[model samples]
Target: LGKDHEILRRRIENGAKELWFFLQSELKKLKNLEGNELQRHADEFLLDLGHHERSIMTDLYYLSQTDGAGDWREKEAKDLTELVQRRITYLQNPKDCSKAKKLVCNINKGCGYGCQLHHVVYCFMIAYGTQRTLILESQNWRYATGGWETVFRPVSETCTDRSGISTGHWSGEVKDKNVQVVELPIVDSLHPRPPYLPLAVPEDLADRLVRVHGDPAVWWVSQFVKYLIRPQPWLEKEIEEATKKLGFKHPVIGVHVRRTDKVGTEAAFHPIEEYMVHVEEHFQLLARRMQVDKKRVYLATDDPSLLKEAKTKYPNYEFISDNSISWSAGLHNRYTENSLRGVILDIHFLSQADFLVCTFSSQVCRVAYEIMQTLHPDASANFHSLDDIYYFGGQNAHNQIAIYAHQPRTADEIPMEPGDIIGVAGNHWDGYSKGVNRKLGRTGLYPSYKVREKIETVKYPTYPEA
Candidate 1:
């Protein structure tokens, strides 16, 4: 049994059996053609199925978000169902989506074959290594359960079309093994990495991971590789152009800032007030050491107004934001597809700069680190490697800098406070906001450093972005 095997089986049972059915049919069709003809048609058919599978994910998200007994529900359902139907339609003519006209709906295509295979392999490997397999049994009463009592057991009853049965067996010894689990929300892990996701994730996740893992390098490396496919041809060319423009300089220092929907929602979130407090504090310290040139800084972010306001507040620095890139502000940057393009371009540009100036953004850190690692691995000893670049955002929950950054404030609508300085759009909030540092210092309450024993002990709702 594999990850989501049962869910996929049910999907096959409920009308879309065509996905599986097509596989059988496709193989037979392949046998009919020969040589180049067979290869061409075979590839086309596979692409067609891939197109449909991708479209189904879009509908699934909309369907899941549908609420009860309202006109909006019907509207959402109808809209989503239409999207599903269009995918079926496109599968009939695969060339349509091949043109790049179709909009990406879901991030990871709902953890398609690759992740399924990965999870399945992980479970199998763990079971084999531990010499323990789950012994599943038939049970009508229980909803779902795990047998933690059994040394290496995490049993599941797969209800399927053929027969919903609980089954298990052992393959290896339990003493020598390494196993860990985490409670990631369904929305997360469902998508591939950035540039393809509908929305961006917040920084707290990074902060939290660092807290748990001690070092964020491995996490960042895995995340980066998960989405490590070929970049769009044009986007790759753009990066090349930017690198050339910079004369292929060593250690491009990226100055990144942004305020966007993702920055708060799933990103490294911080209230407007808290963000300003930290940025101000950090910059004061950073400016004393580094050559601070605000004017030449490449401001890659969501809101132009925020940067404009920041420039106004601090007249000494140069902010490199052009109105031209403003149009892509609210683009559905699924899987970080579109954003990565901008990031790649920015990275090439920044690689020429002397030093990187970053607020709270993983993309900036990841891109800069990767570029440096590739271009000047030996020369750039001071900066981080691509893997170590994961520590770019929040350090940990206990870290004062992290706590303030992940929790944004909220009123009725406007989140930003007036008279306070802003970084970029996604840097804090939409506009001016009061700093949070002064308030934290005033309260005299400090975040605890001890590891939380219970999951419930963790306060999630406190995050304004969540």
Candidate 2:
């Protein structure tokens, strides 16, 4: 392969599809590799072909999720080569940077993709409110797990520059500013701030708008994220194909179990048995609500062992997943390896469900819940957590509950410590945890999932509702 992209593109012309298949084959070879040896192989494979891994991974993940068929043809190798050229151009040419008002948010750092999604949603909301172009500072690996532009559409312009721009803190307005930069924090839900806009503000917000953003509300953020934040065509097409594989009828209940290291030690982990109760109940409710003849459950989880148990227990329920991902892979390898694609694929499938049964603790579940709400706003759905639950649509009745501890803890407080054990009488969106803690025992409010024990209680209320 020469430095000229055209020559490289031509070399792989018809071989693009074959190259992807071989890459997939190489990735699957990890199963045979011994412990600690697997990632080494992955790293070597990436580095050896690092020049083409991103493009290859994009096509590989998409193809892995979907049935490669007509209208779902493999991307032209040249297209990716050209994309490289275009990105280089965007980076070098500063004049291409738009002068329009831009609402840019640095993707939340030092967190998983699920956590960063919260900030992404907020960035979109602020952009929607101010009519500013949204720029994602996704240059950081942690920031953009899968390349941002590859997965989702750019804010306004395809490629925008962040030259002389700072992140972490809010920038009011800058000199020689082509775009108005607003640096939003990772945790925007708890501490709501006015949109850092250019000299020209978009519109005057009424009290209602202010209340929606400031308070721990769901509808406004949902509205903001739903309108924008669409997956690129290639990714969306893959989801469409994956959905067909489910072979399940409508009114499916998506169950997301965040097992593995997420649920603390094995002792503290909430088994599927605990979540199954809610799943069965929700399925029955949705079956009637959707007026469908049958209801199926689509289970998504990190732990293959837990998934295996879930399948054994709920054999009748349909549990669709990407078979390519090794169930036994550790979390570190899961992300580093191509398995992260499976997670994205699962999110796409989970989003299509008519109902959802998930824990408020897992950002993965929360993100899926929001997607379902956005995709099917009119579709009757219920989101259930361990302690409490909420109905999607009803007779103007926002049915939210509080979880209170029956017995007093060592320390009496609304927000409990991470190790604090308490009884949960109610559940709400993750954001509502603080309010629940206050109502139950107003001594203190802890971060959700940060300080935890068995039973019920709101722990964290850092992010806002959506």
Candidate 1, 1-466: lDDT as tens digits: 4435445445535535667788788888888889999989988996787555644543443343334223443453344334322322222232222221111111222332223212332332222222222122212211112211111122222211111122112211231123211111122232222121211212334444323332333222223222222244555566677555533442223454545654555345433333333334334434443555443445455564566666776565455554344334444532233443444455445444545544423444444443443222121322322111233222122122222222233332122222222221111222222223333232212222211211111211121211
Candidate 1, residue 422: the lDDT equals 24
Query: What TM-score does structure 1 among the candidates reach?
Result: 0.32
Q: Per-model C-alpha lDDT, please?
A: 0.35, 0.50
Clashing pairs counted in every model:
48, 16
| Estimated TM-score for each candidate | 0.32, 0.55
The window of 10 residues in a row where model 2 has the poorest summed lDDT is 455-464
How high is the lDDT of residue 462 in model 1? 20
